[PDB]
Amino acid sequence: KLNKDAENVVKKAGIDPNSLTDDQIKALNKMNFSKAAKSGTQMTYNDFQKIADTLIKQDGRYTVPFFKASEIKNMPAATTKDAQTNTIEPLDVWDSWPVQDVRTGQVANWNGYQLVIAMMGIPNQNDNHIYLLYNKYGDNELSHWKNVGPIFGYNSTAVSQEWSGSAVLNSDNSIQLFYTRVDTSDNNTNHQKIASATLYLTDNNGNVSLAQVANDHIVFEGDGYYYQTYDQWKATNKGADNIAMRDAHVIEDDNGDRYLVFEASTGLENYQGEDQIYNWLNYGGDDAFNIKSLFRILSNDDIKSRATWANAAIGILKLNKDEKNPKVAELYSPLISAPMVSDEIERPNVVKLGNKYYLFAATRLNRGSNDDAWMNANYAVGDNVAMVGYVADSLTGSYKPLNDSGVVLTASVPANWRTATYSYYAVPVAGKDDQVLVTSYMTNRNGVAGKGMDSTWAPSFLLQINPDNTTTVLAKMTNQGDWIWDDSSENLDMIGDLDSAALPGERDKPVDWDLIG
Numbered sequence: 005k006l007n008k009d010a011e012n013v014v015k016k017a018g019i020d021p022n023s024l025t026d027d028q029i030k031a032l033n034k035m036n037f038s039k040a041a042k043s044g045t046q047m048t049y050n051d052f053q054k055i056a057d058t059l060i061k062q063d064g065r066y067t068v069p070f071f072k073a074s075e076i077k078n079m080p081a082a083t084t085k086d087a088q089t090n091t092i093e094p095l096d097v098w099d100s101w102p103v104q105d106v107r108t109g110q111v112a113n114w115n116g117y118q119l120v121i122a123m124m125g126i127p128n129q130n131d132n133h134i135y136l137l138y139n140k141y142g143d144n145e146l147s148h149w150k151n152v153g154p155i156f157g158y159n160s161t162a163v164s165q166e167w168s169g170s171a172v173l174n175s176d177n178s179i180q181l182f183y184t185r186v187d188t189s190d191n192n193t194n195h196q197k198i199a200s201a202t203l204y205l206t207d208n209n210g211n212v213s214l215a216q217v218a219n220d221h222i223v224f225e226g227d228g229y230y231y232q233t234y235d236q237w238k239a240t241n242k243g244a245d246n247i248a249m250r251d252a253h254v255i256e257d258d259n260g261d262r263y264l265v266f267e268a269s270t271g272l273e274n275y276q277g278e279d280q281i282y283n284w285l286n287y288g289g290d291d292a293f294n295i296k297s298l299f300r301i302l303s304n305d306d307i308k309s310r311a312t313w314a315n316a317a318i319g320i321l322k323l324n325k326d327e328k329n330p331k332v333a334e335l336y337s338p339l340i341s342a343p344m345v346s347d348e349i350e351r352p353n354v355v356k357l358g359n360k361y362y363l364f365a366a367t368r369l370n371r372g373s374n375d376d377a378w379m380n381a382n383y384a385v386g387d388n389v390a391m392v393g394y395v396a397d398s399l400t401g402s403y404k405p406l407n408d409s410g411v412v413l414t415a416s417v418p419a420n421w422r423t424a425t426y427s428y429y430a431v432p433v434a435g436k437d438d439q440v441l442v443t444s445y446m447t448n449r450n451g452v453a454g455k456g457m458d459s460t461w462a463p464s465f466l467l468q469i470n471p472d473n474t475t476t477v478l479a480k481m482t483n484q485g486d487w488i489w490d491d492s493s494e495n496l497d498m499i500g501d502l503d504s505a506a507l508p509g510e511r512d513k514p515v516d517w518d519l520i521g
């Protein structure tokens with residue numbers, strides 16, 4: 005027998021109570037219909053489903069543009085002396101970020117150079133380290149980039165790794181780097197910590213060198229209430245829980261505060277668990293959608309499991325005033341969270357446009373709980389990646405999803421093609437308040453697209469940011485690896501179509517199942 009709340013929602017859904025099984029009835033009687041939202045905004049089960057639906061539709065407003073596949077090359081600077089082996093090798097290059105102006109997010113001009121920090125490593129090896137690259141500011145040629153080498157030096161190992169973050173210019177023209185320090189000494193686990201160091205560079209006759217790395221230290225690795233700690237994860241992980249404490253994005257607000265916006269999972273404030281399946285807030289559709297979703301969740305062990313472990317978070321904390329030796333001043337509740345919905349939302353990024361703050365992130369939809377949604381994405385397109393987006397009136401204020409569901413970009417080609425992309429990272433555009441340039445890496449790692457095909461820098465493309473909290477992808481593309489949009493940067497030749505996006509035979513190529521899930 006249904007309680008009265010369960011009975012209310014069943015009738016509003018326009019389904020007959022007698023058609024419900026005993027297992028279904030007892031599920032509805034567990035439902036918690038009155039949990040007050042924690043601070044911030046959730047990607048709900050309905051939001052996730054709409055994002056995937058939009059991806060399946062391949063609507064030109066949100067689809068990542070087709071890139072002309074003939075044009076795609078390995079990045080010369082990704083052939084470099086490897087941080088671990090100490091030998092010159094052609095490396096995968098993936099997650100990358102430019103040094104930016106801490107206030108505006110514009111790509112910084114350091115003594116006439118643009119500077120990018122990048123994850124690189126040998127395909128099919130555990131080789132995760134970051135490298136500093138440079139080129140003349142405004143230069144548009146992939147091949148003019150040069151690799152200064154690994155920030156943390158040669159003779160490195162997989163026991164201590166560097167994953168992604170951000171970088172800005174300090175007031176004295178040194179660089180403050182935020183990155184992910186990963187310690188794998190505890191049984192090879194990816195123990196992630198947000199770290200920071202100051203980089204001192206020098207410039208001699210067209211060459212930029214890394215003179216010194218100072219003040220390298222851990223900033224934050226979770227508190228337990230707002231964000232999940234390594235100990236918490238380890239306490240309950242049997243192989244189904246993600247661990248995330250990474251991808252820290254530094255930005256300074258109008259009030260002179262530096263913040264980190266970062267990737268994590270929620271803590272005890274609103275923790276993962278089987279109870280989240282029974283928190284009505286997490287669903288976010290009408291009654292009929294919500295009930296159908298509950299029943300689907302319960303009918304599949306995988307989905308139930310995923311829902312039980314899902315609690316991705318985009319966090320924020322305020323740093324203290326020391327530019328070069330940052331520590332946490334205040335922790336806040338996540339800006340965005342996805343309890344029940346996804347256990348992985350990465351590369352959070354904030355861009356200020358006018359008086360608004362746009363929060364973007366990359367995600368692979370196959371890390372969400374709704375297996376039907378992401379498998380349908382894979383079936384329709386051959387990939388499940390997206391960029392999501394929100395907007396707020398202040399850096400810490402309430403973020404509202406863009407384009408209804410939060411969808412911003414959707415995958416347009418199969419994951420194992422040369423022109424597949426991930427790790428979308430938007431950079432503002434000089435003298436434009438309604439556009440950002442979307443950068444990404446191209447070709448998925450570890451040789452999945454074929455012989456000699458390394459992860460490289462994608463051509464970048466403009467995304468228009470509209471005043472009504474929507475976005476529109478524009479048919480404006482650059483060369484590979486362009487971080488700076490201007491009137492010199494357009495290269496319309498790079499834009500492909502559904503056909504030219506593919507090398508010969510890729511349309512009929514066998515799917516890489518491990519890759520797409």
Ligand SMILES: [Ca+2]
Nearest residue numbers: 156157158159
């Ligand atoms: Ca060294």
Ligand SMILES: [Ca+2]
Nearest residue numbers: 276313314315
């Ligand atoms: Ca989790």
Ligand SMILES: [Ca+2]
Nearest residue numbers: 486488489493
């Ligand atoms: Ca450019």
